[PDB]
């Protein structure tokens, strides 16, 4: 008996109603610019595929973010790109600015455009209770977007969250993860980092949709109220879902591959154990008390779920009374 089939209960069918060449990035044709119409002016940093610089625009003399890509698949060079294509004028999307070679290494590099950002190591622990919430709410406008468009991001985590504070604009970024949603579609568990990988990948169900994102941000979100960065600290994959499952409980872990009769490894069921579904109040503490309210722990709630179907959408999210003030203030 082989795993229950899932379909995603928002934006099911968008991609197969839009036109081939939207979805089948392989046919895509690529136009490659001159590197050289970009000088690197210094390291952003050493990414985890590629090479960031900040560079500036000789023609005209604007400041833009070169990232150097590392040696990957053509094909998956096209679709980050048919991805970031799609996704333009995107709310609090990223905006691919040109697509150039190096003359010489002829080394395929993306062109965006620039983001004053500070880092969440130094600017997460200055956030007052609002700023919280108004972050969250622009990076759910990003996240309704391309799940509307069809497009799984699947790799949701701070550093891909560039925020210039103080212009308050917030920008979704590294989109070479993201993936085209297409109902039935088995697609690949090794996708996001450890500490925000869904428990569809850590039990390796494979017929995930958009909802994977939102357990991502419900882990951000997690670290950001209480303070704990991350929130759940395993030290490999396996380990990530015991670290879950002490939060979550046991109970709606094992309910939850009953249910999709997903067959667990055989190494997850010594480590996993039994723990009870644990109060947010444990979390909460001197320190981190103002940044937790009934709001907040109910719309977090709401997010960490093991049954992904039983999660938020982006746009439910938004529609939550823990964004009622935030929604106010933007009229
Ligand atoms: N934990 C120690 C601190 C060092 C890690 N770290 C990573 C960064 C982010 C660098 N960065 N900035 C980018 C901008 Br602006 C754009 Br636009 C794009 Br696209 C990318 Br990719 C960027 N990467 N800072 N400290
Ligand atoms: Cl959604």
Redo the contacts with the bound molecule.
């Keep these: 008996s082989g795993p229950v089939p899932s379909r995603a209960r928002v934006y099911t069918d968008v991609n197969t109603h839009r036109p081939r060449e939207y979805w089948d990035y392989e046919s895509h044709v690529v136009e490659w610019g001159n590197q050289d119409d970009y000088q690197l002016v210094r390291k952003?940093?050493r990414?985890k595929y590629?090479e960031?610089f900040e560079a500036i625009n000789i023609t005209n003399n604007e400041k833009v973010?070169v990232?150097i890509l590392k040696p990957v698949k053509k094909k998956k060079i096209k679709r980050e790109i048919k991805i970031l294509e799609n996704l333009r004028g995107g709310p609090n999307i990223?905006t691919l600015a040109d697509i150039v070679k190096d003359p010489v290494s002829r080394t395929p590099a993306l062109v965006?455009?620039?983001?004053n950002?500070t880092?969440f190591?130094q600017l997460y622990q200055t956030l007052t209770d609002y700023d919280i919430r108004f972050y969250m709410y622009e990076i759910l406008k990003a996240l309704d977007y391309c799940h509307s468009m069809g497009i799984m991001h699947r790799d949701v985590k701070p550093?891909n969250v560039?925020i210039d504070h103080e212009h308050r604009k917030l920008?979704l970024?590294?989109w070479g993860l993201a993936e085209f949603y297409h109902p039935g579609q088995e697609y690949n568990v090794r996708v996001a980092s450890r500490y925000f990988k869904g428990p569809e990948l850590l039990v390796d169900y494979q017929m995930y949709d958009y909802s994977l994102d939102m357990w991502s941000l419900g882990c951000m979100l997690a670290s950001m109220i209480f303070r704990k960065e991350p929130f759940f600290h395993g030290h490999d994959n396996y380990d990530q879902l015991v670290r879950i499952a002490k939060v979550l409980g046991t109970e709606d872990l094992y309910d939850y591959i009953d249910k999709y009769n997903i067959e667990l490894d055989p190494r997850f069921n010594d480590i996993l154990g039994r723990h009870s579904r644990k109060r947010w109040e444990r979390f909460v503490h001197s320190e981190n008390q103002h940044l937790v309210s009934p709001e907040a722990l109910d719309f977090l709630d709401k997010l960490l779920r093991y049954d992904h179907q039983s999660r938020l959408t982006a746009r439910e999210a938004m529609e939550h009374p823990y964004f009622y003030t935030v929604v106010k203030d933007q009229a």
């Design positions: 952003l940093g990414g590629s960031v973010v990232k990223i965006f455009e620039h983001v950002n880092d190591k550093h560039m920008r970024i590294d």
